[PDB]
Amino acid sequence: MAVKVAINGFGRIGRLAFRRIQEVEGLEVVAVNDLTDDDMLAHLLKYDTMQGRFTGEVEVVDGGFRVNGKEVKSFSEPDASKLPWKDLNIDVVLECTGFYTDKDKAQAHIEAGAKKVLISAPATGDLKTIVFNTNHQELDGSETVVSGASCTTNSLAPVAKVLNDDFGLVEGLMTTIHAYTGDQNTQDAPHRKGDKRRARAAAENIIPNSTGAAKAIGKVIPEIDGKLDGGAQRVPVATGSLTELTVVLEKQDVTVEQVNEAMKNASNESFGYTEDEIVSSDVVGMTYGSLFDATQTRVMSVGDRQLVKVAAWYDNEMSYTAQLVRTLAYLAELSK
């Protein structure tokens, strides 16, 4: 009956993927895997610094833990191949560890016994990369492994599409003012990936860092492949981010009114429209994958030449999770 989901890596996205699936019919989290015991998991689910107390009742039992009456088998196998997926009849695995961001790598879940895997990040290898309500239609059924893209890709894609579909994108650069993440250091320290900037203190700094989101957009919107590039500035807020896209268009004499009105026509559950003057903390916990802020739309014109600047908010945590669970639930209902 219900689709059996296992969340591998019960961290920020795993825990939020969990909170989201409670209120989704025919989608059930039966298993959860991490590198810690049930006691820490139950607690980190109950309490969230940025997102707030879990609405239901998390209670810890033998093996796993019970949420609102139902039990969830918890594990701590670092080797995904060794997890009891076939025994549990797992239909889909939410790969949220950040260590299986490759088609061949994530195959360990399929080797373990899962039918499908969805990775909560951009992934190397031959697979579809799915931003929901932008290209979830390219999913047909045959898929064993799928990438849920990055948070920034989910914020960028729907604005990137409206821009090219309606105006004809010549080229563009993107910079995202981003909240800090787990991969960053609390203090000045040697970094695991050798990055000298993620090495720096996340909460006391403006930190530049590279992101694929812009350069990798061709995987999601093939028609604009290799028209966007750019990176990120990482700033001291614990969640919530903003994408800024500066573009050159084919249509001349483009006005500010046009750009905003075109975004409002393209608004769904995934791509929001706001004319209110909000800040990063106002989007904390929002379920829009991308929220177009109409007040930040700017157009430079020196004669018959234009530059078009736009901005979209995204709670890199919840915003992305909402999209991932959407992408997940769709992929699952595509199996019969």
Question: Binding of ligand NAD at residue 8 (CB under 6 A)?
Answer: yes
Q: What is the DSSP code string of 262-331?
A: HHHHT--SSEEEE-S---GGGGTT---SEEEEGGG-EEEESSS-EEEEEEEEE-TTHHHHHHHHHHHHHH
Determine the residue with CB nearest ligand NAD: 11
> Cα–Cα distance between 273 and 291 in angstroms, integer?
6
Question: Binding of ligand NAD at residue 145 (CB under 6 A)?
Answer: no
Least spacing, CB of residue 257 vs ligand NAD, in Å: 31
> Cα–Cα distance between 324 and 321 in angstroms, integer?
5
Select the binding partner of residue 172 from a second copy, ligand NAD, none (C-beta < 5 to 8 A, by kind): a second copy
Is residue 13 part of an annotated ligand binding site? yes
Q: Is 96 one of the annotated active-site residues of the chain?
A: no
Question: Binding of ligand NAD at residue 290 (CB under 6 A)?
Answer: no
Question: Binding of ligand NAD at residue 150 (CB under 6 A)?
Answer: yes
Three-class SS of residue 226? coil
The residue length of the chain stands at 336
Question: Binding of ligand NAD at residue 14 (CB under 6 A)?
Answer: yes
Nearest to 118 by CA among 143, 150, 86, 146: 146
Q: Identify which of residues 23 and 276 has a Cβ nearer to a second copy in the complex.
A: 276
Q: Identify which of residues 105 and 161 has a Cβ nearer to a second copy in the complex.
A: 161
Among 10, 292, 313, 314, binds ligand NAD (CB under 6 A): 10
Three-class SS of residue 37? coil
Tally of helices (H runs) and strands (E runs) in the chain: 7, 17
Least spacing, CB of residue 327 vs ligand NAD, in Å: 12
CA angle 217, 160, 240 (to 5 degrees): 85
- Count the site residues for ligand NAD by CB under 6 A: 25
Among 9, 64, 172, 230, binds ligand NAD (CB under 6 A): 9
Enumerate binding residues for ligand NAD (CB under 6 A). 8-14, 33-35, 78, 96-99, 101, 120-121, 150-151, 181-182, 316-317, 320
* Enzyme catalytic residues: 151
